[PDB]
Amino acid sequence: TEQEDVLAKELEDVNKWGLHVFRIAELSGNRPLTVIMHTIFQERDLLKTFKIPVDTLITYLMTLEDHYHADVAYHNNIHAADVVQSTHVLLSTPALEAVFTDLEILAAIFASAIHDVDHPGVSNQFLINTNSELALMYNDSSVLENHHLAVGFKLLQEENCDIFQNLTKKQRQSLRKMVIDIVLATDMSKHMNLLADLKTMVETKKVTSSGVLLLDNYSDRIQVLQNMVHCADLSNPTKPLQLYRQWTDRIMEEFFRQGDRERERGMEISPMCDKHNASVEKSQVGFIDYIVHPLWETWADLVHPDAQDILDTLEDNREWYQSTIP
Amino acid sequence: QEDVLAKELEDVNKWGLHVFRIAELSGNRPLTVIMHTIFQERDLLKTFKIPVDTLITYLMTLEDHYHADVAYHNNIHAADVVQSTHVLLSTPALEAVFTDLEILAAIFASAIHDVDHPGVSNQFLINTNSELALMYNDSSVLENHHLAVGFKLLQEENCDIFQNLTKKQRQSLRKMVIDIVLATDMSKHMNLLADLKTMVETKKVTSSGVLLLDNYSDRIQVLQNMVHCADLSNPTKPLQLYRQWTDRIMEEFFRQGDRERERGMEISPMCDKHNASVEKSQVGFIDYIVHPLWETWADLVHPDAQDILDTLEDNREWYQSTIPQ
Ligand SMILES: COc1cc(C[C@H]2C(=O)OC[C@@H]2Cc2ccc(OC)c(OC)c2)ccc1O
Numbered sequence: 060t061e062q063e064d065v066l067a068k069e070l071e072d073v074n075k076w077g078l079h080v081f082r083i084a085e086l087s088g089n090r091p092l093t094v095i096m097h098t099i100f101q102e103r104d105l106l107k108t109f110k111i112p113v114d115t116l117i118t119y120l121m122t123l124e125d126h127y128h129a130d131v132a133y134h135n136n137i138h139a140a141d142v143v144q145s146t147h148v149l150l151s152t153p154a155l156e157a158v159f160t161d162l163e164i165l166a167a168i169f170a171s172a173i174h175d176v177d178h179p180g181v182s183n184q185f186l187i188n189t190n191s192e193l194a195l196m197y198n199d200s201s202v203l204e205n206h207h208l209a210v211g212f213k214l215l216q217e218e219n220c221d222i223f224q225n226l227t228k229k230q231r232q233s234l235r236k237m238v239i240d241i242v243l244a245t246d247m248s249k250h251m252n253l254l255a256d257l258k259t260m261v262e263t264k265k266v267t268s269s270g271v272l273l274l275d276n277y278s279d280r281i282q283v284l285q286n287m288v289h290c291a292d293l294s295n296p297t298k299p300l301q302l303y304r305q306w307t308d309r310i311m312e313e314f315f316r317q318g319d320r321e322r323e324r325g326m327e328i329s330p331m332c333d334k335h336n337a338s339v340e341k342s343q344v345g346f347i348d349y350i351v352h353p354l355w356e357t358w359a360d361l362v363h364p365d366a367q368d369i370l371d372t373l374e375d376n377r378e379w380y381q382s383t384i385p
Numbered sequence: 386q387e388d389v390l391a392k393e394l395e396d397v398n399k400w401g402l403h404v405f406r407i408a409e410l411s412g413n414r415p416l417t418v419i420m421h422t423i424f425q426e427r428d429l430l431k432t433f434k435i436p437v438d439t440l441i442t443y444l445m446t447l448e449d450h451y452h453a454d455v456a457y458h459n460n461i462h463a464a465d466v467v468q469s470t471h472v473l474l475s476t477p478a479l480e481a482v483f484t485d486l487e488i489l490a491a492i493f494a495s496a497i498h499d500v501d502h503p504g505v506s507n508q509f510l511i512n513t514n515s516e517l518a519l520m521y522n523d524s525s526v527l528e529n530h531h532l533a534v535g536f537k538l539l540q541e542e543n544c545d546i547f548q549n550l551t552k553k554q555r556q557s558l559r560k561m562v563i564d565i566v567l568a569t570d571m572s573k574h575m576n577l578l579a580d581l582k583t584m585v586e587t588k589k590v591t592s593s594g595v596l597l598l599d600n601y602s603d604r605i606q607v608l609q610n611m612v613h614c615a616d617l618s619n620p621t622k623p624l625q626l627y628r629q630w631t632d633r634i635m636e637e638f639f640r641q642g643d644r645e646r647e648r649g650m651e652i653s654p655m656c657d658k659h660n661a662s663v664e665k666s667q668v669g670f671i672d673y674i675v676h677p678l679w680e681t682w683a684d685l686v687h688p689d690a691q692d693i694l695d696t697l698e699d700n701r702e703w704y705q706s707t708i709p710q
């Protein structure tokens with residue numbers, strides 16, 4: 060119960076950017092997704108709101124967590140827990156106070172939890188180019204993301220796993236649609252289109268008399284949730300450096316293992332996946348400059364000035380990686 | 386009785402092929418015999434080095450994955466859509482538009498476009514929480530499944546009709562086939578029609594009247610609308626054919642409505658056998674869907690679709706006359 064006390068203390072940071080998610084994974088016995096989701100559901104009163112039995116929540120979360128691969132270095136249950144917790148912090152931003160309903164909040168957190176389930180540790184392009192069964196099933200289109208949704212939803216049908224058993228039919232239908240719309244938007248090939256649309260929304264943004272974002276139709280509401288989860292998914296370089304560097308080590312391992320499979324198959328090796336011709340530091344600076352900072356600066360504009368500290372951390376971490384190059 | 390079948394197959398280039406007769410005379414293999422005939426007529430076996438035995442083995446296996454107990458979405462419909470696409474690809478206004486790989490993709494897409502169809506709609510599959518809708522996240526559920534089956538069957542023994550295509554050819558063909566079949570999702574009708582109207586408004590032609598389509602986006606949109614028109618071509622056929630298609634779709638609709646009734650769900654439009662108006666539904670279908678679509682097609686290929694449009698308007702007038710005052 061001493062370990063349990065230490066875990067509880069660490070979970071006190073669940074509302075903070077920079078939670079010690081790797082320490083939570085160890086202290087929880089490799090159940091970071093289960094314990095962070097349960098803590099967040101308690102913090103947001105979601106079990107009471109949606110009449111979710113606690114044993115059903117825990118059973119589902121444990122089964123979902125089991126369907127992340129413990130043998131992939133990056134796209135595992137720790138990444139899922141991190142994206143869940145990051146989405147939870149973004150949802151609490153002052154610019155969004157009272158903007159989303161409880162069902163939308165539930166959808167965004169559930170989408171984050173399932174968004175990479177059963178990820179094999181290789182990209183959509185690799186699955187397409189190797190004629191995989193997954194790419195055959197999904198017609199080369201959002202292959203991974205369609206699979207993560209189908210698994211996340213199928214698991215609700217296992218014994219004592221239907222956490223949505225007490226929602227109305229209309230609530231379940233709406234939640235299902237929003238979860239699909241959010242996870243499909245995490246397909247990395249959609250990033251540019253998603254950001255272009257977010258930029259349009261910032262350029263045209265409306266704020267209520269209370270100072271919060273005005274979102275008066277489904278398209279705008281879902282677009283904000285899609286970009287929120289995509290920011291959470293691309294949040295590693297915005298975290299304190301000791302967390303960011305562990306994420307870099309993990310993604311590089313997954314990339315290099317994919318590159319080794321590509322090399323052995325005589326395929327051209329994907330960018331950043333050739334361990335014999337890699338520049339990890341240049342690759343992080345490029346990732347920040349071309350992808351992560353454009354996205355996060357736009358998100359920070361949407362919610363100005365709420366995300367200023369996050370953006371400042373991203374910029375400091377860019378400067379740090381750059382300083383290692385010369 | 387291969388002589389009568391060969392005679393019937395001599396009409397493979399004509400709108401109004403006796404496809405039901407062919408289905409009967411071929412021992413319920415219209416898809417195989419019509420695909421084979423078209424591949425010969427277009428010299429596709431030589432062009433793509435397709436071994437004839439592989440072609441037949443694949444076609445028979447694909448045909449077997451259409452359900453024999455579904456009245457409309459079966460192998461006869463697949464064969465009809467194939468042959469209708471084959472005729473549309475020969476529209477004079479489209480001469481020189483499409484490459485041989487694009488022709489191959491449109492015909493293969495038509496052949497597979499409804500394979501393994503269970504005889505119920507996407508909305509039925511979604512609202513019944515079916516395994517198919519769970520797999521495909523409620524999005525083009527049937528059409529994703531038809532593509533996955535159609536491609537998976539190429540992996541059966543002696544079924545890889547594309548074995549001698551180059552690697553780039555196979556990649557391009559696969560993408561085009563996916564783009565075409567997913568566009569056959571009926572819920573996309575208005576979007577496709579909009580694309581088609583835009584292409585008509587901005588159409589570039591030679592001084593002969595031949596369409597010039599420079600970019601892939603425009604050409605795939607033409608092929609999407611072409612296969613969609615073929616899919617929605619029953620009311621533009623000779624009336625004796627059209628009336629058989631109406632009988633078949635109504636049987637399939639009513640069976641869906643019977644399953645819906647027994648499961649106590651709301652019965653979909655046209656699916657309630659105790660409350661149906663078959664003839665009014667056909668006139669409505671032509672007025673709101675098939676005629677707008679085919680008139681826009683006819684504008685795109687003006688004036689080469691005028692006989693097809695003529696037949697459609699004749700058949701509309703006939704069905705209207707069957708509705709009493
Ligand atoms: C959307 O843009 C990109 C997407 C991708 C593929 C993504 C994926 O599939 O899993 C994660 C990958 C994003 C990523 C996360 C953490 C990183 O470092 C900690 C990192 O380093 C390069 C890259 C690569 C490069 C891109 O530019």
Ligand SMILES: COc1cc(C[C@H]2C(=O)OC[C@@H]2Cc2ccc(OC)c(OC)c2)ccc1O
Pocket residue numbers: 506571574617619620627630631634655666667670674
């Ligand atoms: C795109 O618009 C619609 C689509 C649909 C659903 C389609 C489908 O899934 O299978 C075939 C159906 C089209 C169809 C074909 C032949 C017909 O009669 C010979 C017919 O009669 C009503 C309707 C129904 C109504 C529509 O208006």
Ligand SMILES: [Mg+2]
Pocket residue numbers: 174175203245246
């Ligand atoms: Mg993902």
Ligand SMILES: [Mg+2]
Pocket residue numbers: 498499527569570
């Ligand atoms: Mg279809």
Ligand SMILES: [Zn+2]
Pocket residue numbers: 138142174175292
């Ligand atoms: Zn992810």
Ligand SMILES: [Zn+2]
Pocket residue numbers: 462466498499616
């Ligand atoms: Zn069809």
